[PDB]
Design an enzyme around this catalytic site. Structure first.
Site, PDB file in Angstrom:
ATOM      1  N   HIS A   1       8.343  17.150 -40.783  1.00 32.49           N
ATOM      2  CA  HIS A   1       8.217  16.669 -42.133  1.00 32.49           C
ATOM      3  C   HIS A   1       7.446  17.700 -42.936  1.00 32.49           C
ATOM      4  O   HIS A   1       6.924  18.663 -42.382  1.00 32.49           O
ATOM      5  CB  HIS A   1       7.460  15.340 -42.137  1.00 32.49           C
ATOM      6  CG  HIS A   1       8.204  14.220 -41.481  1.00 32.49           C
ATOM      7  ND1 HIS A   1       8.830  13.224 -42.196  1.00 32.49           N
ATOM      8  CD2 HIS A   1       8.434  13.946 -40.173  1.00 32.49           C
ATOM      9  CE1 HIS A   1       9.405  12.377 -41.362  1.00 32.49           C
ATOM     10  NE2 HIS A   1       9.182  12.794 -40.127  1.00 32.49           N
TER      11      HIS A   1
ATOM     12  N   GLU B   1      12.043  17.482 -47.482  1.00 28.63           N
ATOM     13  CA  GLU B   1      11.121  18.167 -46.581  1.00 28.63           C
ATOM     14  C   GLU B   1      11.937  19.096 -45.696  1.00 28.63           C
ATOM     15  O   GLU B   1      12.500  18.674 -44.674  1.00 28.63           O
ATOM     16  CB  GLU B   1      10.351  17.160 -45.736  1.00 28.63           C
ATOM     17  CG  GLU B   1       9.574  16.130 -46.545  1.00 28.63           C
ATOM     18  CD  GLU B   1       9.044  15.025 -45.673  1.00 28.63           C
ATOM     19  OE1 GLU B   1       9.099  15.188 -44.440  1.00 28.63           O
ATOM     20  OE2 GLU B   1       8.590  13.993 -46.204  1.00 28.63           O
TER      21      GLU B   1
ATOM     22  N   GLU C   1       4.053  17.867 -39.471  1.00 30.13           N
ATOM     23  CA  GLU C   1       4.082  18.259 -40.872  1.00 30.13           C
ATOM     24  C   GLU C   1       3.888  19.771 -40.951  1.00 30.13           C
ATOM     25  O   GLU C   1       2.894  20.299 -40.452  1.00 30.13           O
ATOM     26  CB  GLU C   1       2.969  17.527 -41.638  1.00 30.13           C
ATOM     27  CG  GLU C   1       3.034  15.989 -41.583  1.00 30.13           C
ATOM     28  CD  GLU C   1       4.090  15.411 -42.516  1.00 30.13           C
ATOM     29  OE1 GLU C   1       4.236  14.175 -42.564  1.00 30.13           O
ATOM     30  OE2 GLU C   1       4.780  16.196 -43.199  1.00 30.13           O
TER      31      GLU C   1
ATOM     32  N   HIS D   1      13.509  13.375 -44.100  1.00 37.54           N
ATOM     33  CA  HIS D   1      13.317  13.303 -45.533  1.00 37.54           C
ATOM     34  C   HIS D   1      13.934  14.575 -46.097  1.00 37.54           C
ATOM     35  O   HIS D   1      13.398  15.686 -45.912  1.00 37.54           O
ATOM     36  CB  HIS D   1      11.838  13.175 -45.888  1.00 37.54           C
ATOM     37  CG  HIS D   1      11.204  11.933 -45.344  1.00 37.54           C
ATOM     38  ND1 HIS D   1      10.334  11.944 -44.276  1.00 37.54           N
ATOM     39  CD2 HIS D   1      11.340  10.636 -45.706  1.00 37.54           C
ATOM     40  CE1 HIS D   1       9.945  10.708 -44.017  1.00 37.54           C
ATOM     41  NE2 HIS D   1      10.541   9.895 -44.869  1.00 37.54           N
TER      42      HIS D   1
HETATM   43  N1  LIG Z   1       0.882   8.114 -41.505  1.00 39.42           N
HETATM   44  C1  LIG Z   1       1.852   8.088 -40.597  1.00 39.42           C
HETATM   45  N2  LIG Z   1       1.981   7.030 -39.807  1.00 39.42           N
HETATM   46  N3  LIG Z   1       2.688   9.115 -40.485  1.00 39.42           N
HETATM   47  C2  LIG Z   1       2.680  10.340 -41.270  1.00 39.42           C
HETATM   48  C3  LIG Z   1       3.959  11.106 -40.941  1.00 39.42           C
HETATM   49  S1  LIG Z   1       5.430  10.335 -41.552  1.00 39.42           S
HETATM   50  C4  LIG Z   1       5.013  10.154 -43.264  1.00 39.42           C
HETATM   51  C5  LIG Z   1       4.866  11.497 -43.999  1.00 39.42           C
HETATM   52  C6  LIG Z   1       6.133  12.319 -44.194  1.00 39.42           C
HETATM   53  O1  LIG Z   1       7.158  11.785 -44.691  1.00 39.42           O
HETATM   54  O2  LIG Z   1       6.088  13.533 -43.878  1.00 39.42           O
HETATM   55  C7  LIG Z   1       6.069   9.282 -43.890  1.00 39.42           C
HETATM   56  O3  LIG Z   1       5.930   8.918 -45.077  1.00 39.42           O
HETATM   57  O4  LIG Z   1       7.047   8.944 -43.188  1.00 39.42           O
HETATM   58 ZN   LIG Z   2       8.618  13.231 -44.317  1.00 39.25          ZN
END
Ligand SMILES: N=C(N)NCCS[C@@H](CC(=O)O)C(=O)O
Ligand SMILES: [Zn+2]
Ligand SMILES: *[C@@H]1O[C@H](CO)[C@@H](O)[C@H](O)[C@H]1NC(C)=O
Length: 383
Positions: A181, A76, A269, A73
């Site tokens: 992320h 991020e 994260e 992303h």
């Molecule tokens: N809840 C789940 N299965 N994963 C969280 C991490 S990815 C999430 C968050 C992010 O983008 O950091 C996404 O939207 O892809």
């Molecule tokens: Zn992300």
């Protein structure tokens, strides 16, 4: 002590700045740094991975290939810079600092600072929260790459970036992996979804849950802030969570690693603020430093070995099963290698392959005390 000069000038590395730095390392470090082209983004930007190894020419038998990906992303961004930092850190210190020297000698490491250049380019430094439309988060066509991978719950033409990584992930026997992320501070592991397709707050665990929980804890436990579990208004016991239990999502890279390869990928994260300011970066480095090293060293737990001929000749695509984990077999490499990450304990391991009589089982006591996974081989007779 440590050469961490890369901090004397906090700033976000651009696409040009990244390609430039990766080439420099390659010539700066001829035998240990190598650049790999994975593909290109919609808008022509190179998707690049820097490999670091004892010897970049090959991969020493039974050395674990591992990868770190960031910035899928585009908005991020911290992970992006942390991987840029790691590259320099490892290379410029591996001969000076024993631990690292040993890490590098024993592991085949690949670093992908960004997986979404186009997404990044469209993002705005300073934005803790993503932009209108979620612009910058998705690629140039505005699709969410973390929804674009094949789903285990059911032949390309995805996004360029996805396709590139898909190809890559299945191209080598990656043992362990993490992708970074922003938006929260927590260590997340498979699965991210289920057949129930629940919105959230319901665990969709993996056959390898113990190991996964150990991986996630390795990172969080070593992260002074993540370890707490109450960041960004979130409540995550021990600073880790199951993807699905957080909230379900489909088509993610994480679960794709596990379900379509041997690889065990975590989702990590790093910050509450998706795109913080440079001055923040040096702090983020000091926090994640230990968690990024220690996680890498988790690619050494469990066991590893060769499934071989009576000719003593490697059987490729053999299966190696662990009692109670038979739903997740390891598929041997072209050289008949396998690495099976394991929690401490004792196991009955066995191997099988088409055209071969399934080996007799072997019992092994896995203590994860020593530096490298316990060796354990197999000879199989043809049927
Ligand atoms: N809840 C789940 N299965 N994963 C969280 C991490 S990815 C999430 C968050 C992010 O983008 O950091 C996404 O939207 O892809
Ligand atoms: Zn992300
Ligand atoms: C790593 O490899 C180098 C070169 O092969 C070797 O000299 C060293 O003993 C190994 N281990 C380290 C750096 O601790």
């Amino acid at each position: 002590k440590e050469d961490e000069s890369f901090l004397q000038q906090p700033h976000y590395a651009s696409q040009e700045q990244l390609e430039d730095l990766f080439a420099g390392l390659e010539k700066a470090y001829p035998n240990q740094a190598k650049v790999h082209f994975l593909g290109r983004s919609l808008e022509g930007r190179n998707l690049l991975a820097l490999q670091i190894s004892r010897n970049t020419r090959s991969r020493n038998l039974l050395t674990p290939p591992v990868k770190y990906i960031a910035n899928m992303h585009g908005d991020e961004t911290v992970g992006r810079q942390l991987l840029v930092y790691m590259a320099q850190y490892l290379l410029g210190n591996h001969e000076r600092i024993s631990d690292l020297g040993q890490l590098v000698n024993s592991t085949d490491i690949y670093l992908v600072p960004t997986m979404n250049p186009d997404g990044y380019a469209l993002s705005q430094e300073g934005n803790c929260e993503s932009l209108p439309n979620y612009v910058g988060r998705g690629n140039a066509a505005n699709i969410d790459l973390n929804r674009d991978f094949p789903d285990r719950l059911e032949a390309q033409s995805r996004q360029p970036e996805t396709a590139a990584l898909v190809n890559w992930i299945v191209s080598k026997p990656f043992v362990l992996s993490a992708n970074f992320h922003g938006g929260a501070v927590v260590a997340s592991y498979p699965y991210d979804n289920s057949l129930a397709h629940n919105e959230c707050c319901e665990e969709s665990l993996t056959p390898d849950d113990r190991v996964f929980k150990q991986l996630a804890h390795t990172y969080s436990d070593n992260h002074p802030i993540m370890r707490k579990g109450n960041n960004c208004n979130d409540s995550f016991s021990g600073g880790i969570t199951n993807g699905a239990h957080w909230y379900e999502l489909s088509g993610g890279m994480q679960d794709f690693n596990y379900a379509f390869s041997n690889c065990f990928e975590l989702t990590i994260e790093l910050s509450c603020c998706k795109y913080p300011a440079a001055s923040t970066l040096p702090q983020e480095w000091q926090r994640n430093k230990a968690s990024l090293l220690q996680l890498l060293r988790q690619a050494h737990i469990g066991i590893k070995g060769l499934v071989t001929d009576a000719s003593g000749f490697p059987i490729a695509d053999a299966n190696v099963y662990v009692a109670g984990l038979e739903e997740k077999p390891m598929r041997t490499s072209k050289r008949g290698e396998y690495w099976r990450l394991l929690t401490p304990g004792l196991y009955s391991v066995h191997a099988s392959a088409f055209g071969y009589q399934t080996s007799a089982p072997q019992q092994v006591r896995v203590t994860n005390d020593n530096q490298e996974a316990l060796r354990l081989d197999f000879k199989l007779a043809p049927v």
